[PDB]
Amino acid sequence: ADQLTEEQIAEFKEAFSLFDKDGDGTITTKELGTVMRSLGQNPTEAELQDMINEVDADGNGTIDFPEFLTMMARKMKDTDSEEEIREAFRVFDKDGNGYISAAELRHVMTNLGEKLTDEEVDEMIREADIDGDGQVNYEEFVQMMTAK
Amino acid sequence: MSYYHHHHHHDYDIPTTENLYFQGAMGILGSGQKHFEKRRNPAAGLIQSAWRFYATNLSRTDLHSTWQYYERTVTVPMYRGLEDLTPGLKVSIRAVCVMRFLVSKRKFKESLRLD
Ligand SMILES: [Ca+2]
Ligand SMILES: [Ca+2]
């Protein structure tokens, strides 16, 4: 599953073409960092090298278009990689009914990983049918997010 | 260099002895500093990279560039070229979230396993 239809190739094409400068045909670390820097969020030089290690198995250090397309596309939208996501929650759940409380959920989301501000934490709640007590069923939340 | 000093006085200050004790083996909430502790940062990254992958809307500016195109339409003059190279931020977010997510899976696996 690399596309459903050829329309999606246009979305992938300009996503690549935002990164590539001057038609050299492959994305180097300088180009990859440059788009993010112009937008206004700049990863570390170490992070950029870590990123272009895991992507690009040819191992030359410049990202090719079908390799990028393969990375973007993979299997389309799916209930993907569940054991990796699901067990990640299980390291840090509140109690043996399978939930995380909202106050702790905001504190981990704000201060770890990608570091959310409070409104986008509330947006996570807003996509799930939660009323009253504010306790999040992570296993169900993963089903809703990765629905197909 | 720096030391802590305390004062002790009186007799029979706490005669009752119903101090709590453990009569069995049960799970206790904790972080194992050597290894288990270092999984906090990747797990949060993996979860929040995945959320971006789902997201159709975010608190960030999507529609602002379309409002600038409406200001272009109000002027009476017409230009064949139109806007040039409009930066695609929503497309850019889609491109970086998948890379961040794939890296996050490897980082979760190289924090599940540690030295
Ligand atoms: Ca290039
Ligand atoms: Ca390459």
UniProtKB/Swiss-Prot annotation, chain A:
Function of the molecule: Calmodulin acts as part of a calcium signal transduction pathway by mediating the control of a large number of enzymes, ion channels, aquaporins and other proteins through calcium-binding. Calcium-binding is required for the activation of calmodulin. Among the enzymes to be stimulated by the calmodulin-calcium complex are a number of protein kinases, such as myosin light-chain kinases and calmodulin-dependent protein kinase type II (CaMK2), and phosphatases.
Gene encoding this chain?
A: CALM1
Keyword match GTP-binding: no
Q: Which family does it belong to?
A: Belongs to the calmodulin family.
GO cellular component terms?
A: calcium channel complex; calyx of Held; catalytic complex; centrosome; cytoplasm; cytosol; extracellular region; myelin sheath
PTM summary from the entry reads: Ubiquitination results in a strongly decreased activity. Phosphorylation results in a decreased activity.
InterPro entries noted in UniProt: CALM/Myosin/TropC-like (IPR050230), EF-hand-dom_pair (IPR011992), EF_Hand_1_Ca_BS (IPR018247), EF_hand_dom (IPR002048)
Modified residue annotations for N6-acetyllysine: K21, K94
What are its GO biological-process terms? Answer: autophagosome membrane docking; calcineurin-mediated signaling; cellular response to interferon-beta; cellular response to type II interferon; detection of calcium ion; G protein-coupled receptor signaling pathway; G2/M transition of mitotic cell cycle; long-term synaptic potentiation
Q: Which residues bind Ca(2+) 3?
A: D93, D95, N97, Y99, E104
GO molecular function per UniProt: adenylate cyclase activator activity; calcium channel inhibitor activity; calcium channel regulator activity; calcium ion binding; calcium-dependent protein binding; protein kinase binding; protein phosphatase activator activity; protein serine/threonine kinase activator activity
- What's the subunit arrangement here? Homotetramer. Interacts with MYO1C, MYO5A and RRAD. Interacts with MYO10. Interacts with CEP97, CCP110, TTN/titin and SRY. Interacts with USP6; the interaction is calcium dependent. Interacts with CDK5RAP2. Interacts with SCN5A. Interacts with RYR1. Interacts with FCHO1. Interacts with MIP in a 1:2 stoichiometry; the interaction with the cytoplasmic domains from two MIP subunits promotes MIP water channel closure. Interacts with ORAI1; this may play a role in the regulation of ORAI1-mediated calcium transport. Interacts with IQCF1. Interacts with SYT7. (Microbial infection) Interacts with Rubella virus protease/methyltransferase p150.
Mutation: E140V; reported impact is: In LQT14; loss-of-function variant causing impaired negative regulation of high voltage-gated calcium channel activity; impaired regulation of cardiac muscle cell action potential; decreased calcium ion binding
Name listed for the protein in its UniProt record: Calmodulin-1
Q: What else is known?
A: This protein has four functional calcium-binding sites.
The superkingdom of the source organism is Eukaryota
Region: Necessary and sufficient for interaction with PCP4, residue numbers: 76-148
At which residues is N-acetylalanine found? A1
Query: Where do the coiled-coil regions begin and end?
Result: none
Q: Where is the EF-hand domain?
A: 7-42, 43-78, 80-115, 116-148
From Swiss-Prot, chain B:
Q: How is it modified after translation?
A: KCNQ2/KCNQ3 are ubiquitinated by NEDD4L. Ubiquitination leads to protein degradation. Degradation induced by NEDD4L is inhibited by USP36.
Tissue expression pattern: In adult and fetal brain. Highly expressed in areas containing neuronal cell bodies, low in spinal cord and corpus callosum. Isoform 2 is preferentially expressed in differentiated neurons. Isoform 6 is prominent in fetal brain, undifferentiated neuroblastoma cells and brain tumors.
Q: Where in the cell is it found?
A: Cell membrane
Query: Which residues are noted in the entry as a 1,2-diacyl-sn-glycero-3-phospho-(1D-myo-inositol-4,5-bisphosphate)-binding?
Result: K34
Q: Which domain of life is it from?
A: Eukaryota
Q: Domain description from the entry?
A: Each subunit contains six transmembrane segments (S1-S6) with S1-S4 forming one voltage sensing domain (VSD) and S5-S6 contributing to form one quarter of an interlocking pore-forming domain (PD).
The protein's role, per its UniProt record: Pore-forming subunit of the voltage-gated potassium (Kv) M-channel which is responsible for the M-current, a key controller of neuronal excitability. M-channel is composed of pore-forming subunits KCNQ2 and KCNQ3 assembled as heterotetramers. The native M-current has a slowly activating and deactivating potassium conductance which plays a critical role in determining the subthreshold electrical excitability of neurons as well as the responsiveness to synaptic inputs.
Q: Which disease is it linked to?
A: Seizures, benign familial neonatal 1: A disorder characterized by clusters of seizures occurring in the first days of life. Most patients have spontaneous remission by 12 months of age and show normal psychomotor development. Some rare cases manifest an atypical severe phenotype associated with epileptic encephalopathy and psychomotor retardation. The disorder is distinguished from benign familial infantile seizures by an earlier age at onset. Developmental and epileptic encephalopathy 7: An autosomal dominant seizure disorder characterized by infantile onset of refractory seizures with resultant delayed neurologic development and persistent neurologic abnormalities.
The record's similarity note reads: Belongs to the potassium channel family. KQT (TC 1.A.1.15) subfamily. Kv7.2/KCNQ2 sub-subfamily.
What does the subunit comment say? Heterotetramer with KCNQ3; forms heterotetrameric M-channel responsible for the native M-current. Homotetrameric; forms a functional homotetrameric channel resulting in the expression of a small M-current. Interacts with calmodulin; the interaction is calcium-independent, constitutive and participates in the proper assembly of a functional M-channel. May associate with KCNE2. Interacts with IQCJ-SCHIP1. Interacts (via the pore module) with SLC5A3/SMIT1; forms a coregulatory complex that alters ion selectivity, voltage dependence and gating kinetics of the channel.
Q: Which residues of the full protein are shown?
A: 326 to 560 of 872
